[PDB]
Design a protein around this nucleic acid. Sequence first.
RNA 1: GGCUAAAUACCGGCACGAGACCGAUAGUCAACAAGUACCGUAAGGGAAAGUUGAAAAGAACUUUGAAGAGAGAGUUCAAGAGGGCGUGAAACCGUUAAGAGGUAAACGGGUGGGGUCCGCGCAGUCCGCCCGGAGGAUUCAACCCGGCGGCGCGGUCCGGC
RNA 2: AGCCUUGAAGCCUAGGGCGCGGGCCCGGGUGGAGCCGCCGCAGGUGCAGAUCUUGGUGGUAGUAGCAAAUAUUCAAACGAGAACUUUGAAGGCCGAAGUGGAGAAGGGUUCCAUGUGAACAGCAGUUGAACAUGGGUCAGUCGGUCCUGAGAGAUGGGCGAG
RNA 3: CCCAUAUCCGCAGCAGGUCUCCAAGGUGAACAGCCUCUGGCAUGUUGGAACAAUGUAGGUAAGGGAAGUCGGCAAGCCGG
RNA 4: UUGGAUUGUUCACCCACUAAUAGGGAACGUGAGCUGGGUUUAGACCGUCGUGAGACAGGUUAGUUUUACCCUACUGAUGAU
RNA 5: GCCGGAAAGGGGGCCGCCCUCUCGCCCGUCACGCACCGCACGUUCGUGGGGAACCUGGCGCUAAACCAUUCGUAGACGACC
Lengths: 153, 62
Amino acid sequence: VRYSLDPENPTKSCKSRGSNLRVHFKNTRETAQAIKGMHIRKATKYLKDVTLKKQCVPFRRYNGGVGRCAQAKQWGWTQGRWPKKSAEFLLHMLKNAESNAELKGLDVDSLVIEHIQVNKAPKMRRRTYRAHGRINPYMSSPCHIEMILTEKE
Amino acid sequence: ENFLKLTHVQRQEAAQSRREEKKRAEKERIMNEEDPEKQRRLEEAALRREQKKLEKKQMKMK
RNA sequence: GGCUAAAUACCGGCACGAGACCGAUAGUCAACAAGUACCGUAAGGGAAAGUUGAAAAGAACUUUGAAGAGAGAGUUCAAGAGGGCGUGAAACCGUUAAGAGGUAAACGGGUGGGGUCCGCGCAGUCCGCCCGGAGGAUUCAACCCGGCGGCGCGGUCCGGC
RNA sequence: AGCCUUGAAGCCUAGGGCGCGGGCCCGGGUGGAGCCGCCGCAGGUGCAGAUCUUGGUGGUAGUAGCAAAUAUUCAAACGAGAACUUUGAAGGCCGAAGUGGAGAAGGGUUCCAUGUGAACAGCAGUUGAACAUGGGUCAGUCGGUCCUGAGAGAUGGGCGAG
RNA sequence: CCCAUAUCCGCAGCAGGUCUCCAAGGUGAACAGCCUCUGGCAUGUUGGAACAAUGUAGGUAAGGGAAGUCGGCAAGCCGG
RNA sequence: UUGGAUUGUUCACCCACUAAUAGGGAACGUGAGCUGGGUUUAGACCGUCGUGAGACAGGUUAGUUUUACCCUACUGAUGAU
RNA sequence: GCCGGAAAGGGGGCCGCCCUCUCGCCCGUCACGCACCGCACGUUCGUGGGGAACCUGGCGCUAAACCAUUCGUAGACGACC
Ligand SMILES: [Mg+2]
Ligand SMILES: [Mg+2]
Ligand SMILES: [Mg+2]
Ligand SMILES: [Mg+2]
Ligand SMILES: [Mg+2]
Ligand SMILES: [Mg+2]
Ligand SMILES: [Mg+2]
Ligand SMILES: [Mg+2]
Ligand SMILES: [Mg+2]
Ligand SMILES: [Mg+2]
Ligand SMILES: [Mg+2]
Ligand SMILES: [Mg+2]
Ligand SMILES: [Mg+2]
Ligand SMILES: [Mg+2]
Ligand SMILES: [Mg+2]
Ligand SMILES: [Mg+2]
Ligand SMILES: [Mg+2]
Ligand SMILES: [Mg+2]
Ligand SMILES: [Mg+2]
Ligand SMILES: [Mg+2]
Ligand SMILES: [Mg+2]
Ligand SMILES: [Mg+2]
Ligand SMILES: [Mg+2]
Ligand SMILES: [Mg+2]
Ligand SMILES: [Mg+2]
Ligand SMILES: [Mg+2]
Ligand SMILES: [Mg+2]
Ligand SMILES: [Mg+2]
Ligand SMILES: [Mg+2]
Ligand SMILES: [Mg+2]
Ligand SMILES: [Mg+2]
Ligand SMILES: [Mg+2]
Ligand SMILES: [Mg+2]
Ligand SMILES: [Mg+2]
Ligand SMILES: [Mg+2]
Ligand SMILES: [Mg+2]
Ligand SMILES: [Mg+2]
Ligand SMILES: [Mg+2]
Ligand SMILES: [Mg+2]
Ligand SMILES: [Mg+2]
């Protein structure tokens, strides 16, 4: 579909996408900025370490109350977390992009995740119940995602 | 992009061949499984996976 | 004690025609399964909601994944129109590019720096006259013929109005 | 003898300019069918506020919170997937004024079976009172039906513009 | 079929409210409290790791014993 | 520059100790710090006033004291150049 | 090569030699160099500061920090030992 950034060379570049992914947008924006320039083996390894809490995800723009960990001193940051649902969504999508670069005959072991952006999807609506007979919104903040890998030797 | 479109048939053929090889290897591993209980569990899972694929195809076609 | 058509009235009913009216938050509450969904024990209250395309031609088939979801392929003039789909603004957000950054930011006056494009810049205006320098016409004046028009106190010409 | 599918309205624009200004004209893009200049005519005619109206969206914020009633653990199965489903083994609670077993009012299909995992069940679910398919309530003796109770209510009559 | 800490009314699977029937063993005066059997459930819209402050709900405090505070509020003593 | 008896008290007054028991301010410092005794809603009692409803810086008794997760400040904790 | 400098340390003085010219400075002779045709940021500090990447060799260098783990002299989490 119409992406945001077009690749500099369509043959040695693979695409992926995700629409209305019931994750958190702030978490996915942070675990996407952590992956933004990595190499695809570095990424799948990192995102697995994030689920095993061997490495973290520095929380830079959405870091209210986000507590401080010890594994963030590798990113020169202080705050960070271990988003699991968001390290598994853009891992099933890094898998999709792999299986789309094999459909193009690229070298999966040479792919660098070059462009990756997360957008904000239409909120899903629920409702909670508060004191004095008041009902409040309990809305969900889903996200769109889209990555582009590239052979860069 | 035009070149990739021209080459589109070859890429599909290669993708189909690699699936035929992967399926052949899966059948060979099932054939080579010495334990009959393991072989039956693997076979039942493979058949059920195929059945799920067939149902999904029929739903998409519908 | 009584009756009595016509001229006269009509925001209900059936059937019509029209408009210097509104054009989907407007016009009836209601352009749509609207006095519907919903609320109230009841009397009553009462919405929101139109648009793919000329035609569904509504994406076969391959592929990863359990699936949603994608990547290809195809339909169409166009999916940058893909089943709440014409156009698709603003606030708000993501990413890319460029700059900047300790007196919150923003602002008016003045310059300078860098960018972005524009001038389609990069040898710089043309025009009249005259002089000379080399060429080319079927060419000037003056006469003759025919037509046309203006003016005429043609002192005061003929005939009209 | 206006402009327009050789691209109108609309919208976007680090492009060129005009006007003191209200505003306007060009270029590029997007779009797909209507639109404007002049002389007059008419008006539901210009928004920054009105604790304005309707709709949309932010910072707060990945924050507050998901803390009443003692309590969970191990192995196995199904499954892509298991802290939460199912079986079994432990440990515990309710402790006959019960977290048991049945009914009235009320609900109305919530009952039962199979499947689904989109939405919902404020985590997750392989589960559900969710969704989709189908089933299910059998009477001379159980009740209604009948009788009157407090009371309601016609006729006759009376009143009353009705 | 539910008949109630999820089938009803409270906007909800809401610690509220909502009419009855039956009614085991031990202790004990006892349909009190506490443990248990029949029957039921999985801790009441989530888990894991930590064990700071400040909270919330329970406790215990040398010597003194209302000096505290508007006031013995609260807690404590007493208890068959 | 204190410990207490009385008062809601501020004030006052007295006991005791002490070196001394000086005076004050900060939105008459300080209620998202507390308390809520007084004052100062609605209930009631008495007195005086009013024919009456009602009134009383006149007594009496009972009377809901909400929110910080924002920015700053401060206290600690990471880090930044 | 020897000397002397510490307040935020001197590329200074001196020892020599085996190098090399009588030019360097003043006053004159002698002619020349783009004399770019009146014209602006000229003439230095400047082998400037930073940044890349290049060639060309000479001498040489082969480490730590953080995380994971662990501890409890520490602790909400980070941090710390
Ligand atoms: Mg921030
Ligand atoms: Mg905060
Ligand atoms: Mg907090
Ligand atoms: Mg609530
Ligand atoms: Mg309520
Ligand atoms: Mg008459
Ligand atoms: Mg007419
Ligand atoms: Mg409308
Ligand atoms: Mg409209
Ligand atoms: Mg309307
Ligand atoms: Mg609308
Ligand atoms: Mg529309
Ligand atoms: Mg189009
Ligand atoms: Mg379109
Ligand atoms: Mg159309
Ligand atoms: Mg559109
Ligand atoms: Mg930048
Ligand atoms: Mg703009
Ligand atoms: Mg009008
Ligand atoms: Mg406005
Ligand atoms: Mg929290
Ligand atoms: Mg029961
Ligand atoms: Mg039962
Ligand atoms: Mg059931
Ligand atoms: Mg949920
Ligand atoms: Mg019988
Ligand atoms: Mg009557
Ligand atoms: Mg508990
Ligand atoms: Mg419950
Ligand atoms: Mg639980
Ligand atoms: Mg004591
Ligand atoms: Mg003692
Ligand atoms: Mg006292
Ligand atoms: Mg005292
Ligand atoms: Mg007491
Ligand atoms: Mg004060
Ligand atoms: Mg205060
Ligand atoms: Mg207060
Ligand atoms: Mg009081
Ligand atoms: Mg009173």
